């Protein structure tokens, strides 16, 4: 049906603290009378452009900022105009993640980066280098365990290694992305993905390992290390594993370079509730009390709100999160990012499974990541 | 870097009859027919890693259909296009949606008369040429 006037419907991904967010929604309803419904649909980031293009969907969509430029280019997001006083409550670099063509298109919530999570009982001294892992795995397999398991189905998790020695998505210069300069099939990207494929070939990882398999193995104490973000920590807590969160291993002496996401809340351009959505987001969610309610459910990472982040920063897990973030790069928010991710997803899976060589997989992905833009050049108006 | 096939030929010291071109997407060699069709449709040479590429028919049709289905948008009558760019229709690049050939001045003036709109796809304006409007 059409978006309902006089309430708020929120979409947020199923790995985030949606029950905590619903608690913020209950506070809003208690104070204002406005009911807040929080949902976590499958593939919400693909559903949103479909249903919002017909004028339907949630009032507010949560996702990392990398999806939002495509939404805004399609006219699906309302322009955000907080007062200067509210803008100063959040870190400047998080506003930049949600700025598209000079306009704010979402509220930033929290900064996410992958870290190395390790079992302190199994592995008191986690490795500093990727190159140590195979020998470390041989050692741990003799103890009935293994060194490392992480999600190999989503390119988010393998990108830090691909980027370490030179891979990049779109070249960034003068505050701008050149979609003609894609770095998916260069020598550094090939080196990183080849190292990952060799780990699988040498029986240190399995190509089929996904989020659920890796999470279960680490939280059952079967593997010494995983790679994951802050949303995963509270399940590890309840599994009673004694864990640490630390800097990602280096590859060829270079830091792993995670793509940093800013969890962001956009307002549907079709919402008849834009004023209420702004009141909820600015004055209920983006407060100490509101972010704490979400954080208590699933940890947000380093939040955009300065007053609360200065408390979270004292947590060594948050310090490690931001150390890894600072070595990585903030994701572009340009419309081309989804094509980039779909392209690299196929490349990593095809290479990991041996269906394609590393070179053929990444050569295909380099093309797919820019297919639309290549078509624009072919059909454009030149000489 | 030459953007059009004749200049690329006048720069590798060859002709359109002889030039060997690969598709930007699949890297397969173009058939000679595809080379001629590339030039007649006034397509643009694209450079990747400093090398020139054209496009084969299969990939051009494949990614064209994607771009149409996945970047649907709006339509305008020619007079509005004229107002919007200030130039006459004959001065604007408008391609056939089906064969990608630039519309002729006659085909564009025909669109105007029949009160037919042009269609926007990812910032590209399209119509339908007379040849693709007369086929089994
Ligand atoms: O349909 C067959 C196919 O379905 C399943 O995979 C598909 C996904 O279900 C679907 O969501 C879609 O995923 C795309 C996604 O739409 C696209 O936006 C891009 O995703 C990026 C994120 O945008 C980016 O923010 C980041 O996501 C992080 C997130 O920041 C973080 O907070 C946390 O939630 O972890 C996320 C990573 O998991 O990274 C991802 C990229 O990894 O790219 C996605 C594709 O990789 O499309 C999938 C493929 O269709 C099944 O799993 C699959 O096996 C089936 O073949
Ligand atoms: Zn081709
Ligand atoms: Zn035609």
In 3D space, the residue among A8, A2, A11 whose CA is nearest the CA of residue A47 turns out to be: A11
Sign of CA dihedral A27, A28, A34, A39: negative
Torsion of CA A278, A280, A282, A283, to 10 degrees: 130
Quick one: which atom of ligand 1 is closest to the CA of A151?
38
The residues near A164 (Cβ < 8 Å, ≥ 6 apart) are A130, A188, A192, A250, A251, A252, A254, A255, A256, A257
Which pairing describes strands A8-11 and A60-64: parallel, antiparallel, or unpaired?
parallel
Helix intervals (H) in B4-135: 5-12, 32-40, 57-69, 78-85, 105-113
Contact B124 A376 (CB under 8 A): yes
Question: Domains (ranges, CATH) in chain B?
Answer: 1-59 (3.30.240.40), 73-133 (3.30.240.40)
Distance spanning both ends of chain A, measured CA to CA: 50
In 3D space, the residue among A225, A215, A223 whose CA is nearest the CA of residue A127 turns out to be: A225
The residues near A381 (Cβ < 8 Å, ≥ 6 apart) are B93
Residue A366 to residue A189: CA distance in whole angstroms: 11
Of residues A367, A374, A381, nearest to B93 (C-beta): A381
Give contacts of B60 with chain A, Cβ < 8 Å.
378
In 3D space, the residue among A104, A106, A160, A48 whose CA is nearest the CA of residue A169 turns out to be: A160
What would the two tokens of residue A224 be?
């010494």
Q: Which residues have CB atoms below 5 A from the ion given as ligand 2? A: B 23, 25-26, 56, 59
Regarding the beta carbon of A345 and ligand 1, being less than 6 Å apart is answered yes
Best B5, B8, B43 member to test A by mutation, with max A CBs in 10 Å, is B43
In 3D space, the residue among B106, B105, B95, B90 whose CA is nearest the CA of residue B128 turns out to be: B95
Regarding the beta carbon of A215 and ligand 1, being less than 6 Å apart is answered no
Alpha carbon of residue A111 to chain centroid? 9
Distance spanning both ends of chain B, measured CA to CA: 40
In 3D space, the residue among A169, A159, A164 whose CA is nearest the CA of residue A366 turns out to be: A169
User: Within 13 Å, how many C-alpha atoms sit on residue A155's CB side?
Assistant: 27
Residue A370's closest chain B neighbor by CA?
Answer: B25
**Residue B129 alpha carbon to ligand 3 centre in Å:** 4
Alpha carbon of residue A292 to chain centroid? 20
User: Which ligand gives the minimal distance to the CA of A374?
Assistant: 2
Best B5, B23, B67 member to test A by mutation, with max A CBs in 10 Å, is B67
Quick one: which atom of ligand 1 is closest to the CA of A155?
42
Residue A283 DSSP code: I
Packing angle of the helix pair A187-201, A358-368 (nearest 10 deg): 130
Contact B63 A377 (CB under 8 A): no
The residues near B18 (Cβ < 8 Å, ≥ 6 apart) are none
Q: A1-112+259-332 has which fold?
A: D-Maltodextrin-Binding Protein; domain 2 (3.40.190)
Helix intervals (H) in A10-149: 18-32, 44-53, 68-73, 84-87, 92-97, 133-141
Residue A150 to residue A205: CA distance in whole angstroms: 9
DSSP A136-187: HHHHHHTTT-EEE----SSHHHHHHHHHHTT-EEEEEETTEEEEEEEESSSH
Ligand 1, atom 51: nearest CA belongs to which residue? A153
The coordinates were experimentally obtained by: X-ray
In 3D space, the residue among B54, B48, B44, B49 whose CA is nearest the CA of residue B95 turns out to be: B44
User: Within 13 Å, how many C-alpha atoms sit on residue A342's CB side?
Assistant: 13
Experimental structure resolution, Å: 1.8
Q: Are A262 and A94 a contacting pair, CB within 8 Å?
A: yes
Alpha carbon of residue A192 to chain centroid? 20
Which pairing describes strands A36-39 and A8-11: parallel, antiparallel, or unpaired?
parallel
User: Within 13 Å, how many C-alpha atoms sit on residue B119's CB side?
Assistant: 14
- Residue appearing with tokens 């947000």: A300
Torsion of CA A195, A201, A205, A207, to 10 degrees: 100
User: Which ligand gives the minimal distance to the CA of A48?
Assistant: 1
Interior angle at CA B134, CA B129 and CA B135, nearest 5: 115
Q: Where are the domains of chain A?
A: 1-112+259-332, 113-258+333-383
**What CATH superfamily is the domain A113-258+333-383?**
Periplasmic binding protein-like II (3.40.190.10)
Which pairing describes strands A223-228 and A176-183: parallel, antiparallel, or unpaired?
unpaired
User: Which ligand gives the minimal distance to the CA of B64?
Assistant: 2
Residue B131 CA: distances (Å) to CA of A123, B100, B134? 71, 12, 5
Alpha carbon of residue B121 to chain centroid? 13
Residue A366 to residue A344: CA distance in whole angstroms: 8
Give contacts of B46 with chain A, Cβ < 8 Å.
374, 377-378
The residues near A145 (Cβ < 8 Å, ≥ 6 apart) are A122, A221, A222, A223, A224
Alpha carbon of residue A374 to chain centroid? 27
What would the two tokens of residue A371 be?
């297919």
- Residue appearing with tokens 């603290």: A17
Of residues B4, B25, B93, nearest to A383 (C-beta): B4
Q: Are A60 and A293 a contacting pair, CB within 8 Å?
A: no
What per-residue string of b and e applies to A354-382 under the rule 16 or more CB within 10 Å gives b? eebebeebbbbbbbbbbbbbbbbbbbeee
Distance from CA of B69 to the nearest CA of A (A): 12
Main-chain dihedrals φ then ψ at residue B6, nearest 5 degrees: -65, -40
Residue A278 to residue A82: CA distance in whole angstroms: 8
């Amino acid at each position: 049906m059409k978006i309902e006037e006089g309430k708020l419907v929120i979409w947020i991904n199923g790995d985030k603290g949606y029950n905590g967010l619903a608690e913020v929604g209950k506070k809003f309803e208690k104070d204002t009378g406005i009911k807040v419904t929080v949902e976590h649909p499958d593939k919400l980031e693909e559903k949103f452009p479909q249903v919002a293009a017909t004028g339907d969907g949630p009032d507010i969509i949560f996702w990392a900022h990398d999806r939002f430029g495509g939404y805004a280019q399609s006219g699906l997001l309302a322009e955000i105009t907080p007062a200067a006083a509210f803008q100063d409550k959040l870190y400047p670099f998080t506003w930049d993640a949600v700025r598209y063509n000079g306009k704010l298109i979402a509220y930033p919530i929290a900064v996410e980066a992958l870290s190395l999570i390790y079992n302190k009982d199994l592995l008191p001294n986690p490795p500093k280098t990727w190159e140590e892992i195979p020998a470390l795995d041989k050692e741990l397999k003799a103890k009935g365990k293994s060194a490392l398991m992480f999600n190999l189905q989503e390119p988010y998790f393998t990108w830090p290694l691909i980027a370490a020695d030179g891979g990049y998505a779109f070249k960034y210069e003068n505050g701008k992305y050149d979609i003609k300069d894609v770095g998916v099939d260069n020598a550094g990207a090939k080196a990183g993905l080849t190292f990952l494929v060799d780990l699988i070939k040498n029986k240190h990882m399995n190509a089929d390992t996904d989020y659920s398999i890796a999470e279960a193995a680490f939280n059952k104490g079967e593997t010494a290390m995983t790679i994951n973000g802050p949303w995963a920590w509270s399940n590890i807590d309840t599994s009673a594993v004694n864990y640490g969160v630390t800097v990602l291993p280096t590859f060829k002496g270079q830091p792993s370079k995670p793509f940093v996401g800013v969890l962001s809340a956009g307002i549907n351009a079709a919402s008849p509730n834009k004023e209420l959505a702004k009141e909820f987001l600015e004055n209920y969610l983006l407060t100490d009390e509101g972010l704490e309610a979400v954080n208590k459910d699933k940890p947000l990472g380093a939040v955009a709100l300065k007053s609360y982040e200065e408390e979270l920063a004292k947590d060594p897990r948050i310090a490690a999160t931001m150390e890894n973030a600072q070595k990585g790069e903030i994701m572009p928010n340009i419309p081309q990012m989804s094509a980039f991710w779909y392209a690299v997803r196929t490349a990593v899976i095809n290479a990991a499974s041996g269906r394609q060589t590393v070179d053929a997989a990444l050569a295909a992905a380099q093309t797919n990541a820019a297919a639309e833009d290549i078509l624009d050049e072919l059909l454009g108006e030149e000489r | 870097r030459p953007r059009k096939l004749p200049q690329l030929c006048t720069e590798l010291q060859t002709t359109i009859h002889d030039i060997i071109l690969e598709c930007v997407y699949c890297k397969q060699q173009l058939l000679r027919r595809e080379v001629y069709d590339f030039a007649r449709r006034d397509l643009c040479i694209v450079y990747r890693d400093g090398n020139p590429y054209a496009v084969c028919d299969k990939c051009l049709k494949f990614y064209s259909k994607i771009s149409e289905y996945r970047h649907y948008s709006y339509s305008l009558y020619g007079t509005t296009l004229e107002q919007q760019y200030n130039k006459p229709l004959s001065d604007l690049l408008i391609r056939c949606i089906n064969c990608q050939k630039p519309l002729s001045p006659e085909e564009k003036q025909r669109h105007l008369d029949k009160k037919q709109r042009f269609h926007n796809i990812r910032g590209r304006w399209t119509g339908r040429c007379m040849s693709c409007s007369r086929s089994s």
